[PDB]
Structure 1
Amino acid sequence: ALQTIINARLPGEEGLWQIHLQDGKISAIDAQSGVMPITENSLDAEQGLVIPPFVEPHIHLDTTQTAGQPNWNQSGTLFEGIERWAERKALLTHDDVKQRAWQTLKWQIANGIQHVRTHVDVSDATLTALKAMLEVKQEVAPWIDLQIVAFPQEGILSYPNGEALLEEALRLGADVVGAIPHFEFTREYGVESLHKTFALAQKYDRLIDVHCDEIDDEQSRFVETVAALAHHEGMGARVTASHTTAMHSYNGAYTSRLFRLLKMSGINFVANPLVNIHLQGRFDTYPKRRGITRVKEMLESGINVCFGHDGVFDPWYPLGTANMLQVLHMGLHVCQLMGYGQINDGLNLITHHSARTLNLQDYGIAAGNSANLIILPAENGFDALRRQVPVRYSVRGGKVIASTQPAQTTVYLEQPEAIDYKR
């Protein structure tokens, strides 16, 4: 088995590094003063970048691969998407869900993703998708640590037996309690639904991840209740507010007041660039707002924010290959995080910040941690992002679980020339 990763570059560090492995864990990390020779049991990073695994903090594996079934989301809105999904949800079968979830999970393994948080719609008395996903979680465990969010897609108080079904999902083993306050019939139901969500999370000792204010409504401020309840309960690390796209439309004075609470609360934020740019701004004519939450300001304020893919060929998103560098690319452009350092540091949005969002306890290139790491054939985050590089090797427990032999491009000029798009 592998004993060392050599010739590795690490974000924020100068030079090359060697990562020693023992019993499936990282035993030590030592700097190199030059290039080390390869040998059996040594995986050569070849002066590429070594980082802990990519993370998918927000995806819907129960809906993945169902776009157009039985109908397409014509308007490209969150609301029609939920209606189209309702039609598909009525046709779910156990094997259907497992097969589609596994198809996307394999793309994720290929893309160096070893941690995934999937929401699963539990506004369904049969809990068909949840039962299937709980089996998938066990089956995929050797390659991906899958967290399941009990997501009451049609509301907690606004759907028949919504609260009972949400609790049933937790009793069956869901890892995270979800909610969707802006979809509840009234603002009061929205606020009350959050009190119920927090009570369930404390009763069962589970994490929280709310689909929060995913709407271009400047009056949708459920995020302040999520943050205040987390602060009151002293549980910010365990709480996440997904989307918060309404924040894109808030006035600046309220946002400034709010940011103090967001920081004090310690809660996490997920932005979903590919889906947000598509679903938000649909009620504007021109000009049209971008609709992504205030990622740049969160980073400047030290508030933990990260990026998810959200949908992969489903009612809310017709594209995708479950590639986090592609998600990152979209987010950096739409959020205008286009300075060299902002782009280079972008990898944090799909690695460390996402691990914090998932409350991971064994993550990072550090002595004592499990030997879970990936190798990118690039010099730094900027280079990896610019060239949209594949994952050369994905290592888990000290063993290679995925590898990509890069494409080879040649142009035939006066003489053949290899093109790698580098400078």
Structure 2
Amino acid sequence: ALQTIINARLPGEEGLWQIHLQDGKISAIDAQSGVMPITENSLDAEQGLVIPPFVEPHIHLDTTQTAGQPNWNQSGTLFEGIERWAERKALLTHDDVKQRAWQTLKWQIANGIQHVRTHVDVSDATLTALKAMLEVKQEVAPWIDLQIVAFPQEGILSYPNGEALLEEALRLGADVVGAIPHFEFTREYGVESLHKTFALAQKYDRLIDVHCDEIDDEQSRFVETVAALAHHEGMGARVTASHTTAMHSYNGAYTSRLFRLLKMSGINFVANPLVNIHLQGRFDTYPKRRGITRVKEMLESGINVCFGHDDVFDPWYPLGTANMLQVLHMGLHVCQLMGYGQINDGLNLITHHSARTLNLQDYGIAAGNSANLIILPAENGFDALRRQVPVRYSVRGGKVIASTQPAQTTVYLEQPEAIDYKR
């Protein structure tokens, strides 16, 4: 029965704020001139930062939690990962997918993530993972709004009945149409697959999220077709180009020309730091490229870009706890967004920009919006990122759905001293 969040700091705002709640929504937001006393029905942010929930714009819940089953990827390569996944085929069932997806979703709830977009491989005639994920979506709805992308992993034109299966996935309820041009047999199939993807999105009124140019090939430019088609249909807001790691290898002249179109099209971009730094640059000896898309330049140009985890504890990425501040930390380093303001503003890459990517209509600490917000025990984005703080409280519909009692560290010098890693 929470009525107020008090003593809240807000990004880009001075001072402390009080967030009033009513009927599961934010009724008003008022500045405070000092610290407010706690009381029944008040959740004290304790001068910590309050932001609208973290978002996971790109993850594969159908493959999550499978690392080491039955064997571990020892080389760490994409190739071996594919083989290790194949060895687990006998365990891939409806219940298995639901159990693993739920395990990661619980970690996400614990990490203040209330919006998740999962890709699901639909290059499977039985659509086993998709059927399982559609049930998971309904089951987790009280805690996470889950979007499902029908992802034609083996291609649309390069896989038997690929287009038919992609459309079947949409008819079953998938929220987003996926594609993977650079994986199609030819450049022509790649371009044609995008026309088919856009046609399906318009036919069913769905969003689009393409695994776009995820390859260190300076000639992989499917992103220009994604942006051009979006501009032509006037649907930029509903379109996302995931990865675009090839952009890391483009010459500057083409990239400059392309950026005009990217801005005009209004499409969204997702970079996946943890996985990109790991899987890109694998064909280089030395020097080795970083392989993340042009995040810094997109921000400078006002192009919406955000960060996803992509994989959690699977053959393609053995690590992760589904933590967005960890994803952000990696991205700030690899993209060299290390100035104070760049780091502080970093939270945008895992909150607001990701909400835009998911085309969310009810997101942000604003009057009238649902009371969905989280509290970080930190002074600002810089502090939260530097100390990799947990989510103190996650509030959804005005109710607490997760909480973390912080770790307590003590050093025993001449006298015991508490250490909080602040100066």
TM-score if structure 2 supplies the norm length? 0.98
Superposed displacement of residue 67, structure 1: 1.7
Superposed displacement of residue 23, structure 1: 0.1
Superposed displacement of residue 302, structure 1: 0.2
Deviations along 1:165-188, one digit per CA (max 9) or x if unpaired, are 000000000000000000111101
Separation of aligned partners in 1, 2:92 and 2:171: 22
Separation of aligned partners in 2, 1:347 and 1:161: 41
SS at 2:179's partner residue?
Answer: coil
Deviations along 1:9-56, one digit per CA (max 9) or x if unpaired, are 000000000000000000000000000000000000000000000000
Is 1:307 equivalent to 2:307 in the alignment?
A: yes
CA RMSD across the alignment: 1.1
What residue number does 2:317 align with? Answer: 317
Separation of aligned partners in 2, 1:413 and 1:88: 51
Superposed displacement of residue 82, structure 1: 4.3
Deviations along 1:237-275, one digit per CA (max 9) or x if unpaired, are 000000000000000000000000000000000000000
Percent identity over the alignment is: 100
Q: Please list, as runs of the form range in 1=range in 2, the aligned pairs for 1:161-200 lying within 5 A after superposition.
A: 161-200=161-200
Superposed displacement of residue 92, structure 1: 1.3
Check the 8 A contact 1:211/1:243 in 2, yes or no.
yes
Deviations along 1:111-165, one digit per CA (max 9) or x if unpaired, are 0000000000000001000000000000000000000000000111111110000
Deviations along 1:328-376, one digit per CA (max 9) or x if unpaired, are 0000000000000000000000000000000000000000000000000
Superposed displacement of residue 327, structure 1: 0.1
Superposed displacement of residue 78, structure 1: 4.2
With 84-93 and 351-360 compared, the bigger mean Cα shift is at 84-93
Superposed displacement of residue 314, structure 1: 1.1
Check the 8 A contact 1:76/1:282 in 2, yes or no.
no
User: Residues 74 and 231 (structure 1 numbering): CA distance in 2 closer, same or farther, change over 3 Å?
Assistant: farther
Check the 8 A contact 1:114/1:144 in 2, yes or no.
yes
Separation of aligned partners in 2, 1:399 and 1:350: 22
Q: Please list, as runs of the form range in 1=range in 2, the aligned pairs for 1:76-91 lying within 5 A after superposition.
A: 76-78=76-78, 80-89=80-89, 91=91
SS at 2:84's partner residue?
Answer: helix
Q: Specify every segment of 5 or more residues in structure 1 that has no aligned partner in the other structure, as ranges.
A: none
User: Residues 165 and 88 (structure 1 numbering): CA distance in 2 closer, same or farther, change over 3 Å?
Assistant: farther
SS at 1:219's partner residue?
Answer: coil
Check the 8 A contact 1:77/1:280 in 2, yes or no.
no
Separation of aligned partners in 2, 1:211 and 1:73: 23
Superposed displacement of residue 85, structure 1: 3.6
User: Residues 306 and 355 (structure 1 numbering): CA distance in 2 closer, same or farther, change over 3 Å?
Assistant: same
Superposed displacement of residue 73, structure 1: 4.3
Check the 8 A contact 1:207/1:238 in 2, yes or no.
yes
Q: Specify every segment of 5 or more residues in structure 2 that has no aligned partner in the other structure, as ranges.
A: none
Separation of aligned partners in 2, 1:187 and 1:281: 22
User: Residues 326 and 254 (structure 1 numbering): CA distance in 2 closer, same or farther, change over 3 Å?
Assistant: same
Superposed displacement of residue 66, structure 1: 1.0
User: Residues 108 and 206 (structure 1 numbering): CA distance in 2 closer, same or farther, change over 3 Å?
Assistant: same
Separation of aligned partners in 2, 1:72 and 1:157: 32
Check the 8 A contact 1:111/1:322 in 2, yes or no.
yes
Q: Please list, as runs of the form range in 1=range in 2, the aligned pairs for 1:55-134 lying within 5 A after superposition.
A: 55-73=55-73, 75-78=75-78, 80-89=80-89, 91-134=91-134
SS at 1:58's partner residue?
Answer: strand
Separation of aligned partners in 2, 1:91 and 1:405: 36
Separation of aligned partners in 2, 1:75 and 1:36: 55
Q: Which runs of 4+ in 1 moved over 2 A?
A: 68-91
SS at 1:76's partner residue?
Answer: coil
User: Residues 84 and 227 (structure 1 numbering): CA distance in 2 closer, same or farther, change over 3 Å?
Assistant: farther
Check the 8 A contact 1:149/1:178 in 2, yes or no.
yes
Superposed displacement of residue 81, structure 1: 3.8
Superposed displacement of residue 315, structure 1: 2.0
Check the 8 A contact 1:248/1:292 in 2, yes or no.
yes
Deviations along 1:281-313, one digit per CA (max 9) or x if unpaired, are 000000000000000000000000000000001
Superposed displacement of residue 70, structure 1: 4.0
User: Residues 354 and 366 (structure 1 numbering): CA distance in 2 closer, same or farther, change over 3 Å?
Assistant: same
Separation of aligned partners in 2, 1:80 and 1:236: 37
Superposed displacement of residue 72, structure 1: 4.3
Superposed displacement of residue 69, structure 1: 3.1
